[PDB]
Amino acid sequence: AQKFNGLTVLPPLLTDDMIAAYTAALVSGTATAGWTFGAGAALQIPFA
Amino acid sequence: VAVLYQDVNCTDAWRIYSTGNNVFQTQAGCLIGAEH
Numbered sequence: 001a002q003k004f005n006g007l008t009v010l011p012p013l014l015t016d017d018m019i020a021a022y023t024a025a026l027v028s029g030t031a032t033a034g035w036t037f038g039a040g041a042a043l044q045i046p047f048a
Numbered sequence: 049v050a051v052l053y054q055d056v057n058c059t060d061a062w063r064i065y066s067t068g069n070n071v072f073q074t075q076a077g078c079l080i081g082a083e084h
């Protein structure tokens with residue numbers, strides 16, 4: 001009915017897979033390098 | 049120009065104004081006039 005009366009819903013540019021990929025990259029960066037004071041050149045460090 | 053039809057499945061009576069040489073399907077609908 002919505003479409004028959006000329007009301008359309010458009011898809012977002014970024015899919016769910018892309019957002020999940022971004023979050024996975026952020027978590028991996030925190031676990032591996034854990035950059036502090038910004039997001040530049042990752043510096044590896046043991047988690048402990 | 050290129051034309052995107054949101055509610056048409058062109059994979060392999062189509063409700064499109066005109067066809068072309070670069071009709072193909074995407075996750076956003078049927079696209080005509082653009083090369084992939």
Ligand SMILES: *[C@@H]1O[C@H](CO[C@@H]2O[C@@H](C)[C@@H](O)[C@@H](O)[C@@H]2O)[C@@H](O[C@@H]2O[C@H](CO)[C@@H](O[C@@H]3O[C@H](CO[C@H]4O[C@H](CO)[C@@H](O)[C@H](O)[C@@H]4O)[C@@H](O)[C@H](O)[C@@H]3O)[C@H](O)[C@H]2NC(C)=O)[C@H](O)[C@H]1NC(C)=O
Pocket residue numbers: 057058059060
């Ligand atoms: C737009 O339409 C396409 C094509 O739809 C086909 O044609 C229309 C007219 C109907 O007859 C459909 O039933 C036809 O499929 C859709 O793509 C199809 O999507 C379905 C559902 O996801 C797919 O079915 C799956 O296919 C797999 C097994 O099939 C295997 O063999 C076929 C060849 O016979 C091959 O294409 C496929 O890759 C496999 O090797 C499997 O994932 C699963 O079990 C299921 O059967 C079907 O394969 C798709 N067909 C094609 C040609 O891509 C689109 O989904 C539809 N788009 C939208 C947005 O709705």
